[PDB]
């Protein structure tokens, strides 16, 4: 039964909104202080904390599409969502371009709130 | 620290099950509805183990795990992320090395840790 | 032969809507649950018209000419048809040089309320 | 292979099709295809091929595991349907290494005399 | 442009030179008269496809050719006469031009024209171009 | 090989199919009869040059074609009739073959043949090929 | 201009204090590089310091004039934001007056255009204390 | 398997003896690598030795098992001739129990075919004396 | 420019030729060339060009320092000669950087009515 | 026209000697002090026949066909002539695949003791 | 060691004469029949200074000389070989570095060192 | 006057013969113990002594051509020769190949014999 699946989609959407608005404070509230991240911008390295994503919230016409979302409920305090993210944007040439990414978010419940404890993206920035 | 070497233990049994080509144990370690992102999937999300079966039918290699980080989420779920370096030989026999970024998501159901979803980057 | 001329008409109207960037006429000729395989989708299957709106707004006054080569129409009753054709596009790049691009296209038409609509389409070749 | 009542019929005849191709059975493949079947595929090099004469070369001249991802089905009456899906193929090259390939496929089925047959199909990606 | 019974051969050379001059001047009006309405065409601008009509070349007459210094050179022309009303000429076209801020450039193409006299007037029924 | 007044059009189709079959079988004898001794040719094997005669294609009849499974497919044929004694056909040739240890391969070319009836027999006076 | 680290695995051990000293002078070095401060960098470097780096094209440069070019031209001009991350620092202590740190340096920066780019460089810094102050006698960089 | 050097510019200075010691143990290290002698290489290396090299793909490997693969498979099999040259060695002495050598390593070898090939690698070796014996605590290689 | 009695005549008319090309003087260049002069050069794209009509495009449409290296001269009577040499050209691109180019040149001179003229020339390398 | 046929004869004999690898006949038709620009010389001018002997011995029983396209002959008296032509070579590679190569060639003939000999030649294009 | 810094001195006056674009001094430092191998010569041997003139007509750069080796041959001839690294800026202004392998051949005629031939590799 | 030019050509030819025969002893006699060499096999590094060339004398159908030789006589004890060396050879494919090099030899007279004190080659092995 999808009791909390919508509950996961809610905080996921709030995450997307915090990224879109460039609001780093809301992103800090939704992430564990010791959050780890694999991503193409990490160049294959395991980077910990929000110190790495900060550089993007302080320096950043697009359209985002989420394809094939899968949610794994792991009890009453752990969840994990994986999906394909397709981003349509305009390059410096003003030409339409599209980029695909495969994203995995690991959510943990602490004190009645979902927080990202690990993030894994591949393979487009 | 204590329940971290259990995640490490089932992870080592997982990697060893992959290196020995033991599909029988791998199936036991994976949930039937396990999802996976990996280069072999060509950007698509593959569910189950029917996709991973083909890679068990198919000499000396050496695996080195670097910077393992473990996130504990309660008492029935965890997630381990690490860098996997692999030294091997290519037909002509020259030593080669490949890097991978792996994330395993473990969950305890019926008193047994199992992979529910895993994410790989690189090779 | 008369039944295929209708499909030719609605197809040419579709390509005219894409060429002129008329997204409203495009939405009228497309089913709300339309699926599409296209090079801009990066091998993924996308559903709905929300994915093409981005190309209607941003990408679309440079002269462009479109040519339809060797259409083939399969009639499947009085309410369903399929058309496959080669689409050539002569355009100008940033340097003003004349250029040309080929694209293989498949359109799956379904007559609903006496009005043909695309339920699925498949484009290949260069975008 | 790997992956509400009528959709499973299209899925069934489609799986029978893919297995008829994997085994090299041109007989059952010919029975499941219309004689005027049209095709877009990388083997046709951007051209539109008609009939089954182009596909015979492969059954005659040509360890594989096929996987189907996210099948979508469009029903257009009780005699016309259209299925689109992702086709992953795990195989071995002459070098012996396992390779994987992706191809987006679109099949257009039409019921004629109580039997579904392919009238047109469109594949992109893996040649 | 530079070029290079026999009377008839020369006639074909005449209508061909007028064709090249019409293309160079961007005069689609004269280009239409020398071409059959159902003219067949193979050219690299068609990307391996067969093009019928004059709608396809109109895009190049309108845009590009309507104009920096350009010199054409015809090399090794061969003419096949096939009766009073049919002929075929094949030759090598070399074009010297300038790109952006020249930098003088040169390009080669191999061209075949199939001429047919209809109602006392030579018209192209089909032509073939390579490497352009 | 698969292909695909009107009687005359079909006649051209006949001699053309016989040409393709003669090339496929490596039968230079029959290929010589259907070609004019002074046949003109543009083809990628000539590297942008114009080739006259049948000496040039003989190297391909002797060496290569004298033989793994190969299937030809003719797409979008167009025929221009230019009087009783002249005709021209243009089409797309697609060849399915095998390289070394196939690995089935496919290749496209755009071909133009210029036929001329001399003494009650169609002969090629010139032909043009692209992308092969 | 700032920098982060990953010191949880390194600090655990016998000699926390000296490890912290070497990380301190290392972060002061990287801070002097990020700000183009050639004065502080000169104070933290031995006069006879040797260097291996991609800018040397496989050669062993000695002194500070080779790096002075980059301090004067490239790093002095930087007004764009640059963020440095020190991943997985390992410290080898070799007596009271010598140490050696190795780490992965990840640089987040803005290119010519306004596009964020990331660069990785494996760095080895060899520290030697003379006159009661740690100084670099040799360093080795890989990657660009 | 042999190796040459260029020690005329390095030996001139105050501490000839210790410089010669470090060059000696360095040439013994390279000699153990050229012969695939994992025993001698193990004796000359600290157990907690760290490493940066192109084989590590920008990662910091620790221990000796990563190099053991190359000793067992690649370097044990070598029956072909290999000649190593140590160009421009620079030595930094950091107390009685620590030293650091940097040099250009040029390898003349025979490839798969019988064609002579040359490889360059910039090498930094960090030596620390424990139990009266010099050992590598860290090294850094560039180039292939 | 830069670099036993008759050879200096060929060298003299050759230097006058190269300077006539560098200044863009098509008049003196035409006087020094035979009307039926043939040419191999990279600008001809592997073809053999006849006359001076092909070279006019350059005098009309087109900081250079030319150097001649190792000139060899073959005398074949008192009315025919052939000189071969290396031609280095130091110039500046639109980027402003000094560039250097090499071209091997062969000139075939023939004395007609008491004046040497080029009947044929062959250049390789720099286009 | 008769005077040019002799040059055609000696030129065809030269190409026959190169094709059959007959180095002695090649030395008879070449002046001892012959100069050559050729792609095998890497932009350098080589003198004598010692440089071509290497190609006669080592490189030269695979079927090869040579075609001479558009020859042009300049007569410069009764003892000196020049011929320029395009040379096509159809051959087989290591894989047995038919291949073709173009080459622009210039031959400078000089009649000595009633026998034409090459004093200089210039080849370009692929070797 | 003493007559090595004279070769170094005339070499430094040479390099400085090149950096300042002073053809006048360069001509004095070179024999009129000086031969040269260099990438700008495209593998050919250029004699004299007419070829080097063009490179004097044509902002901050930094030159570093590495591993200079001097061979003394008597009392009127010497030869110095060295590696020349050059840091510069490319139009867009990114710092760049180039390596060169240079060999200068000095000879004392009329009481003055002069280059008779020089050989360069790389940039 | 070319008094010693032929005298330089003699020892140059003897050098070429020592290389062709693989005789490393004769090459040692004709080279100064502290000979320096720039060459493509040195990868831009200045290598000293005959220790580097040894590897080639102990591990090695061709034809060599010398073009445009220039000799610089620098007194009665120093000379310097520069020339272009073109080598025709057969590759592993059995295909004729050709390679160009630009060579500079610096000869010094000591005890009545010419010896190579410096060598510079570019840019083919």
PDB file of C-alpha atoms in Angstrom, chain H residues 1 29-41 67-68 70-78:
ATOM      1  CA  UNK H   1      68.303  -4.968 -16.008  1.00  0.00           C
ATOM      2  CA  UNK H  29      64.165   0.003  -4.986  1.00  0.00           C
ATOM      3  CA  UNK H  30      64.190   0.472  -8.764  1.00  0.00           C
ATOM      4  CA  UNK H  31      66.339  -2.660  -9.049  1.00  0.00           C
ATOM      5  CA  UNK H  32      63.747  -4.617  -7.065  1.00  0.00           C
ATOM      6  CA  UNK H  33      61.023  -3.280  -9.368  1.00  0.00           C
ATOM      7  CA  UNK H  34      62.903  -4.096 -12.587  1.00  0.00           C
ATOM      8  CA  UNK H  35      63.462  -7.687 -11.432  1.00  0.00           C
ATOM      9  CA  UNK H  36      59.964  -8.197 -10.028  1.00  0.00           C
ATOM     10  CA  UNK H  37      61.439  -9.026  -6.606  1.00  0.00           C
ATOM     11  CA  UNK H  38      58.442  -8.434  -4.345  1.00  0.00           C
ATOM     12  CA  UNK H  39      60.389  -9.631  -1.284  1.00  0.00           C
ATOM     13  CA  UNK H  40      63.049  -6.908  -1.453  1.00  0.00           C
ATOM     14  CA  UNK H  41      60.436  -4.317  -2.430  1.00  0.00           C
ATOM     15  CA  UNK H  67      51.555  -3.123  -6.346  1.00  0.00           C
ATOM     16  CA  UNK H  68      51.646  -6.872  -5.676  1.00  0.00           C
ATOM     17  CA  UNK H  70      52.046  -5.795 -10.956  1.00  0.00           C
ATOM     18  CA  UNK H  71      54.884  -7.673  -9.259  1.00  0.00           C
ATOM     19  CA  UNK H  72      53.155 -11.036  -9.698  1.00  0.00           C
ATOM     20  CA  UNK H  73      51.725 -10.646 -13.196  1.00  0.00           C
ATOM     21  CA  UNK H  74      53.622  -7.982 -15.139  1.00  0.00           C
ATOM     22  CA  UNK H  75      57.120  -7.716 -13.662  1.00  0.00           C
ATOM     23  CA  UNK H  76      57.610 -11.381 -12.711  1.00  0.00           C
ATOM     24  CA  UNK H  77      57.082 -12.409 -16.343  1.00  0.00           C
ATOM     25  CA  UNK H  78      59.673 -10.011 -17.790  1.00  0.00           C
TER      26      UNK H  78
END
